[PDB]
Ligand binder design. Structure first.
Ligand SMILES: CC[N+](CC)(CC)Cc1ccccc1
Ligand SMILES: CC[N+](CC)(CC)Cc1ccccc1
Ligand SMILES: CC[N+](CC)(CC)Cc1ccccc1
Ligand SMILES: CC[N+](CC)(CC)Cc1ccccc1
Ligand SMILES: [Mg+2]
Ligand SMILES: [Mg+2]
Ligand SMILES: [Mg+2]
Ligand SMILES: [Mg+2]
Ligand SMILES: [Mg+2]
Ligand SMILES: [Mg+2]
Ligand SMILES: [Mg+2]
Ligand SMILES: [Mg+2]
Ligand SMILES: [Mg+2]
Ligand SMILES: [Mg+2]
Ligand SMILES: [Mg+2]
Ligand SMILES: [Mg+2]
Lengths: 337, 338, 337, 337
């Protein structure tokens, strides 16, 4: 279970094997977004550099590679938000507090069109960032696209609360794998990430098309891909910070698997994601050239959120920094004794 | 029968992405168009007409990042495949099994067989194929040289089946599966994928290439091309009296009208897309490095299909400027014919 | 006099880069070629012949990142300009200074004067300029509207001087500097730069634009097109009895052979490259913000000349497929007469 | 003078105003190259990270933006070499040691096809890197190109010995401006950098064209532009590390200029660089299309080496880190008390 290394499945196969396309504005937007998030959070010279080495701009730059600079900056901001946001439910104050967790979720969701107050970086730094994002989204999105951003952020928040229920309910190692995947499909944040990317991309497929089971499964697959990849790469962080929400921990602790057998099962599910993906595009009806052009762009987005995460996962300072390249090159991921 | 028909959307599913066209299109086109005009002795009129066929447009979407050189060889191959195939459709080989199979036997001989050095003077069409083969040979591994042979073979083979059916009175007795089996070969998509693997510089291992899922992808690209072609070149096959067209077969085999035949073709085009993804679902992974190129090869299948699509609406060989109007309006006119 | 001539290298220095061609060329060519054909009532033959003139190629290199609709706009303007200018070279206004003036009057009045809403039916050529001007007006500032007008006026003015020199019998008494003066206007490059500012979305402040440095860049680009055109349009000017060609002028005034005249043209072309660089030497800075667009503007000046260069060697209007051979071999054949 | 902040001249005007193009292989070559120098030099996690923040890949990715991945990695290596090498003569043990400085350039020049040993990371890490770059250069360059490689590096090495001679001979503040620039045209590393770029871009103009005074002057201007830009941005580093090689230090302590009046002189020099650039290009003869095509790519390399340094200077963790983007925005560069 706790061997000196674990042999990682190939995460760069199938639809993940292509050369990632990185937004050419990455450098400009990182410069603006990194410094802005530092002033907002009041990060010091060393905390600001530590965040800058996390490079959330690499992640967003791959999600929406032809986004214009100003929207990529927005994508960066939103990412800093979700990172600062999610950590409150994983390591921060909302981890074992159902009441406060639901109250943060109600307060954050009312930002988007509701009765929330006007936040400032002083009044509530993280809710401000999300609110600065919403305002920009609202200002260049159809009301239907705005509704989609809400409803997808809502799917993330809903699971966050199921996450804190299972946490305090001692369900973290009772829940089966389907229950865990169902939780993470929301708490991974791919569903609002895709909405963010539709904003950056400038792609607005009609809600009826969007709602088709094929495209919903494309989103579901991409969310599974991110979660499988994330639970491998960020496993050491989950050990170092005591977070149980990791499929490797779940498969060892619940099914008596060896760390290596665990990772192996992750590789089985990853490649079974690729099979579901294609099988789901086979059901995708056609809506004529005009719309299908953007449906394809959308399907690319679901792909890009997953591959953008994969490549970002293997080099971000938040997980393994420069050590992730060695794991990429040799499949060997060292563990802590 | 009808003055026009509503053609099905051919630019849906995967065909709907914005095509990429090789930036070298212009310089490769000015060279290779002049070249084939010298080889074939095209007077000004016939050479201008051939440029308006714009096979360079076709090649420029099969391999959009092919370098100028390889792109010129590709234009060379397409001018070959068109002058060659016409011999079997309207030319001297259309009703001549013996003369067809001697032509096939002598063209195959060019790819390493006992073939002589052809010249533009001695044999102009066989010459172009030799020039392509020379260039293919000098930058390809032996496994890809073979693949190129084996894929041309699949095309050459159905050529001979096509001429047997033609003389054998089978043209309108063959059922739709028999026809598509035939056109999968005679459409030339299999040799075109080998031509593009050359242009794009993608050399997938043969044990991978041979997997039934990639095979099915080559097969779907072929059906897509045969389907789109039959609907576009339909006026040509009428004007020139060629029976090898799913429209004429659906109308003369089953009693469907023009509209219903083209509707059937639309259904089949969308069944292609379903078969595409269902095939991709069975494609296994060979690790990052190979899968990377596998992905490039799948794209080559798509780009052949999509390159044919956009070209078929542009080419003067079919509808010329009125193919743009068919893309704009869905209306494809038919001749009075009586 | 000779069976051919050796043309100097017209593709050196700033002309020697690989041209960038708007990747919307095909989609734009399809629309605009068809469009002008309906307007001018071209029949199958004339329409295809005009399609082989491929003004879309020419426009696609002036503004290689113009969106499809501005490219079509530029194609329409090119089709205009060629129809329009031909009235002055071999058409009716060729020898008529009254009718020529009236035409120049009526056309200028399209641009916010008292011109009637033309129609393909009433006046096709004027219909095309007016369809252009409407599009130029809707997306350009009032300053750029004036600049478009003002630049076309330089073109129109020399047209009137042209008809004055045809009727005045000074087509071969005039000198080269007088001829270059005229052609700098009649060549149409000044409004073609205005068209390109529209196409490429570049809006340099007028006090910058008016700096002698930038005006000499336009002068140079216009000279390049004129020298290049006179070499490649030479066979046409012989076919259609047009006297406006430096080739023809150099042989009458100076007792120059065809070869040494084209060689003078090569000598002048390389002088443009030196005037180009000398003029940029004099170009002040207005800070990164503006300088970024002046640099695009200088490129637009370069792209009109270079686009003209490649189009001149491909178009069916001049040498068609033979032009490619003159670029491969430097030999241009001349008519036996 | 010693103000609290200086207003830096607009460093991004003229030919520096274009949007810089950054090699898409930036992300892959960086991940390779950063880890590689980390291993070679035994950097620890924090030293490695600080080197990643130097982001020397960003600097090379702008020198040859279409260089394939493997050549970009080489370029990164060379840059890691150049910095580790150049600091030995600025802050290191060779800063004041004429005999050992000459022995270093003698041991290093002999790596390029001479009687040098086969270095390894362990025996001599920095010389090992230069050796690895040189083996790659030789493998894919012509003899003439390799000789150019050697001759441009010798220009760097020679001036390094002049720098150490002036340091110890107490001439650091006696040498006039021209002496200083003539020294830095060598020690700034631009000449070998252009050479490194000819390799990365695959551009091999012939030496008879290369030696033309126009192109030699183009390289000079590139060299001055980096020196000027360097002395401005690396002024705080020179203060903090006690290095007298900086035009700002010279102007103040040699003449009578304040630290503000110093940058002012940089600003006039920087814009005079632009003037010289165009005057040299005016004198550049044409060598026919085929050659001129590559000459312009080379003139671009000259420009790109400067413009690459410019953007990298304002991002590097080596100079101002995050505060450089503020100095780009505002033109205010704070100094220590
Ligand atoms: C829960 C969000 N997440 C998951 C790794 C960490 C804060 C970032 C993320 C969001 C969207 C897509 C991919 C990653
Ligand atoms: C018979 C080959 N074909 C089919 C339309 C006509 C000459 C050209 C072609 C070859 C390969 C792919 C697409 C078209
Ligand atoms: C206006 C005359 N000209 C010159 C060849 C032919 C009709 C068009 C033109 C205008 C501007 C740039 C390039 C060509
Ligand atoms: C000595 C040169 N420098 C900064 C001027 C320090 C290592 C790197 C550099 C090399 C080449 C071009 C630009 C910067
Ligand atoms: Mg979480
Ligand atoms: Mg977490
Ligand atoms: Mg995690
Ligand atoms: Mg056929
Ligand atoms: Mg046929
Ligand atoms: Mg057909
Ligand atoms: Mg004319
Ligand atoms: Mg004229
Ligand atoms: Mg002319
Ligand atoms: Mg130093
Ligand atoms: Mg130094
Ligand atoms: Mg310094």
């Amino acid at each position: 279970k706790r061997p000196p290394f674990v042999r990682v499945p190939d995460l760069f196969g199938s639809i993940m094997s292509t050369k990632p396309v990185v937004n050419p504005n990455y450098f400009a937007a990182k410069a603006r977004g990194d410094r802005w998030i530092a002033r907002v959070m009041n990060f010091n010279k060393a905390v600001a550099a530590r965040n800058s080495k996390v490079d959330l701009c690499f992640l967003a730059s791959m999600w929406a590679p032809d986004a214009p600079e100003d929207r990529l900056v927005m994508m960066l901001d939103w990412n800093h938000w979700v990172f600062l946001f999610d950590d409150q439910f994983d390591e921060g104050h909302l981890k074992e507090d159902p009441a406060a967790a639901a109250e943060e979720v109600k307060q954050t969701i009312a930002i988007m069109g509701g009765n929330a107050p006007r936040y400032t970086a002083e009044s509530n730094p993280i809710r401000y960032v999300f609110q600065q994002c919403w305002d920009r989204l609202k200002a260049v999105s159809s009301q239907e696209m705005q509704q989609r951003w809400i409803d997808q952020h809502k799917r993330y928040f809903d699971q966050l609360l199921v996450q804190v229920d299972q946490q305090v309910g001692g369900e973290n190692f009772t829940r089966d794998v389907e229950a865990y995947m169902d939780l993470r499909r929301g708490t991974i944040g791919v569903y609002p990430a895709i909405s963010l990317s539709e904003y950056g991309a400038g792609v607005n497929v009609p809600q009826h098309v969007y709602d088709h089971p094929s495209l919903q499964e494309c989103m579901k697959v991409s969310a599974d891909l991110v979660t499988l990849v994330n639970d491998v790469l960020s496993y050491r962080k989950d050990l170092e910070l005591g977070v149980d929400h990791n499929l490797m921990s779940l498969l060892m602790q619940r099914d008596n698997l060896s760390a290596q057998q665990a990772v192996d099962v992750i590789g089985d599910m990853v490649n079974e994601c690729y099979r579901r993906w294609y099988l789901a595009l086979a059901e995708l009806p056609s809506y004529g050239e005009k719309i299908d052009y953007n449906v394809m762009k959308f399907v690319e987005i679901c792909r890009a959120v997953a591959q953008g995460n994969l490549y970002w996962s293997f080099q971000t300072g938040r997980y393994l920094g420069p050590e992730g390249h060695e794991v990429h090159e040799t499949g060997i991921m060292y563990l802590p004794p």
